[model samples]
Target chain A: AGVMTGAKFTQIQFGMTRQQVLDIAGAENCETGGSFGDSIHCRGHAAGDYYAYATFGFTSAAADAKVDSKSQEKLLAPSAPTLTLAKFNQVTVGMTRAQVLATVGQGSCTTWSEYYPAYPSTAGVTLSLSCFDVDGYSSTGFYRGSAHLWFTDGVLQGKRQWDLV
Target chain B: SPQPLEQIKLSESQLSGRVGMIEMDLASGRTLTAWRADERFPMMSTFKVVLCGAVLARVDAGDEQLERKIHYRQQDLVDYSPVSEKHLADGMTVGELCAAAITMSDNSAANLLLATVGGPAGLTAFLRQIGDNVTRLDRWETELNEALPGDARDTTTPASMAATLRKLLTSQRLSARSQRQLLQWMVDDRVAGPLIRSVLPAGWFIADKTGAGERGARGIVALLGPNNKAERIVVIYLRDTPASMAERNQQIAGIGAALIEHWQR
Candidate 1:
């Protein structure tokens, strides 16, 4: 009952595996149930104030049932996604893009990305920007908190997050 | 006398990270000061200017009205929403929301107008319509300011923002009245006013929007001039620094001072 947030929603990237999708989503079998694998569906994937209920669906494949992205999705919260010091500490340099995504759910679009838009110079310098809402501020103001992972060529190059007052 | 460019470089050295800036002639669109100008930086609240520009464009097209009393509920408020919270019971005008978003950096106010103009992607579409293909509004406020390193979501280049600002304010893209109103709202800026205003040489007119965020990110997009005329546009953005907001403010102000100090050059 806790994975439907715009923050988590951002992390559900295209090339994720079904388990990676299930890790963040933690869903149960849908009552109505659909196809077997390729077009998997699960129900009870619910959480956050902004959304009511959502079902997880995956079409296409990165491999023998790996998530290759497809179809439409559901509504969720724009509030910061839940990120903790422990989870952040799990991130390590040299970890591949998939490893980082699996460790820390794929980030929301609000998160950062570092690929330079140019070639030769800016090209080949692909940086992945996955962001998570760190914490606080209804008791405070504006989301000054965030955790970000910087991946260079699909490897964790550096990591940092901040929460302002 | 030390050149403003050199002084600006010196000020940037004091900070912990990257900074981008541009000083363009409002008259000829010539770039006078360009420091890391092509780099990306979060627009933060400074985007309220562009956000309002989109609104004003809608108004000019008669799709929106300044006096239109838009209504929203308490639940709609996001973080940093001082102005919108007050008007929850008695909705504020579209113009009032624009004023609060730009002048005060009110988050909730910005979100409503964000909605009024059609959310983040909607605003991005507006930027595209205006020939600002470089800048993008990818997320809602507060979240948009994350400024994660190497993350390009919700960011604008100093040059792109400045050029877009010039088009919005100087070009006849919007009606004459709407153009003036956009300028007036900027001139009344409240969020970043105390610091930048203090640094500009006395008697120079400045209309700007300042944005600050996590990771010591800070920036300003402004129109600075003397004799009360906006002669040029200055855009400065700082990111990846571990400095204090005060120091960030000081550093940005120092850059502004250097530009004014060397304006005659």
Candidate 2:
């Protein structure tokens, strides 16, 4: 049986190893046991955080064959979101909360107080931007697990991302 | 002679948050400490070092071998791990798992070792046997992720971890072969990128472990020294820093550079 979907095809880029596919798309429901000789039957939600379910078959070396570039390319054409690092670079310190929200839209913010452990009492208004939810499109490539933006009296003092570290 | 650490002190600005640091000149026993060196912070992956300690101690006691195969199941799956993403078939040997845990910072691999060495209860007993009453591994990897903020998960202090690393280096609790294996794995590790190893002078050697959490808990416990000079063991643990990751890493890097300079003097 063939197990390939449009969403799955879009996410599985050419030359991607099976491990890389599993990392980009979660393997919560992936089953490796099958009569097709070391094939993987995977399925998941088809979205940014969660994307499609499919089966990858092997003919020769079992695990190795399953991720063969030729076999995967034949199974599905190369397709993926053409996201760039442009917007990520535009972020900077000294931007106000209003300006940041206007630029990046609503974000999952975790507020912190100065009294929090390790934080100086004089320092106030710390916000950890979890996800940049812009309209219906959310950039899941948020850095450092998430971007941390520090503020004092609603003014941005510091901002850091994983790419910088 | 003035203490090597008398000139070394980290300002609060340099630390950025709750910090714990202890550096010891292994040759002379001279040491330096700052912040809450004795206080506990979530250990994160550094627990793998302790886990290996327990496993090797067991091997020394004739309980298990490094060649033993550890089966990996679906339940063993967890996020944020390169080893887990491999979708490894059946499982890997205990030795392979140790390499992945130490060298790759593989969370699933570490979890497998934790299960193999009798889970949290056995780990607690091992820590007690080693005279570490303060450090604890209270939950499995999954439970640890779901648990609330507290020492209920694996947790340790800078002083405790420093002492543990020191024991690993000097104590005869494990056989020479076992000690060699542990040291080899640590030295082989490439995942430790942020602390003493990042700032060490060229030709210096380091055997160390690093652990970090999303909540600003970052640290490394390492044995560092020049190729020809005596070594110093250092531990730096920072918790609850309300700063950017770049700033946090810079703080750690700054601390490491100063510590190395102090040891040089």
Candidate 3:
């Protein structure tokens, strides 16, 4: 307490995992005292020399994560989400909803279909539909994520993501 | 009547392991008795003839000096021959460098003279001026890749070098005095390898130089026999030879002796 002319010294690294990072700041819990497991929020020191910290809201399901195909929720390097044709180009099995969304982007509009009896499953599961505006000219599949996207002159013009089953 | 001289027959191989043949006339214009002399072998030091001519040209143009001395300490010691470390005397003269280069095949001396004569690039331009394409120079060791494997990965063709020699001879390209100096140094040359020395008897005057490396070898024999008599230039490049140096010398000499003798007759 007697030493004056003080400035606290802190350290940081790039591509650090969330848990590994929070633990470095002497946090008692990896997550805050919140019930939402989909996304978490916290403030920390600046990122690095070339970047600024940014945060965005994302949603997921406990049963199965909803991915926007361009969301970055499922990525190992979950820095940001990018819109894409698939859930993720290099997706793995048994990924959580957040992980899936990390790899794919959020859809433009979303709609959910109620669970109905299926011939295979004893109880049918509700399937959500997220649509991406593919064709800037018209809305063909608004509620489905962009499964196929066509671009004209570096702008996303056509997008169509739909439910198969 | 001219004495019935022995028929010249030469059998040799090049460093590239290719066989080669040469037959020369001892008299007249030192006509070809029999030959397969086609392309050039990288002239190696035999190229000093060209350098001599080039020096004479520059000196004549007042672009170079005969009494100029080049410091050997600055040269890149390459071409790992015996003359690599020689520091020629300062202000000794461009003419002296030319003679040392020709007679002794002194590489360091040659490079120094080349620097005085505007470097290899200048010589290349000189070659271009004379319409002798394909003659080039660089400090190539046996380190680089050759079109032929295991050769001193440099470049030259027998035809190109012969053209160089032919130009020097035909044009009398040097000043009459410089040409005499060049001819004298060649006759008094100490680096007498068998390619020229083996053919003539003791005191057989031939102004020539020989160059040999790992995968390549070249020789030019300018017959400067007694009395400035039958003048001839015989070239043999063996890249693919199996013959021993002694054997190749015998072959080269047999041809050289024949050419000089034929020209003499």
Best-fitting candidate, measured by lDDT? 1
Cα DockQ of the candidate 1 complex: 0.02
**TM-score of each model, paired residue for residue:** 0.64, 0.62, 0.49
iRMS for all predictions?
A: 16.1, 14.2, 34.7
**C-alpha local distance difference test of each model:** 0.68, 0.58, 0.43
lDDT of 1 by residue, B188-231 (tens): 88566445687877788999888877777778889989998899
- Candidate 1 lDDT score at position A94: 88
Q: Which candidate is the best by TM-score?
A: 1
Arranged by TM-score with the best first, the candidates are 1, 2, 3
Q: Report the interface RMSD that candidate 3 achieves against the true structure, in angstroms.
A: 34.7
Per-residue lDDT over B139-250 for candidate 2, one digit per residue giving the tens place of the 0 to 100 score: 8653342213455467788778777766765687888998888888888776566556677889888887776664566667777778844387777766766565556666
Point out the higher-scoring one by TM-score: 2 or 3. Answer: 2
Best-to-worst DockQ order: 2, 1, 3
Query: Candidate 1: lDDT of B138?
Result: 93
Q: Is candidate 1 or candidate 3 better by lDDT?
A: 1
> What lDDT score is found at residue B87 in candidate 2?
39
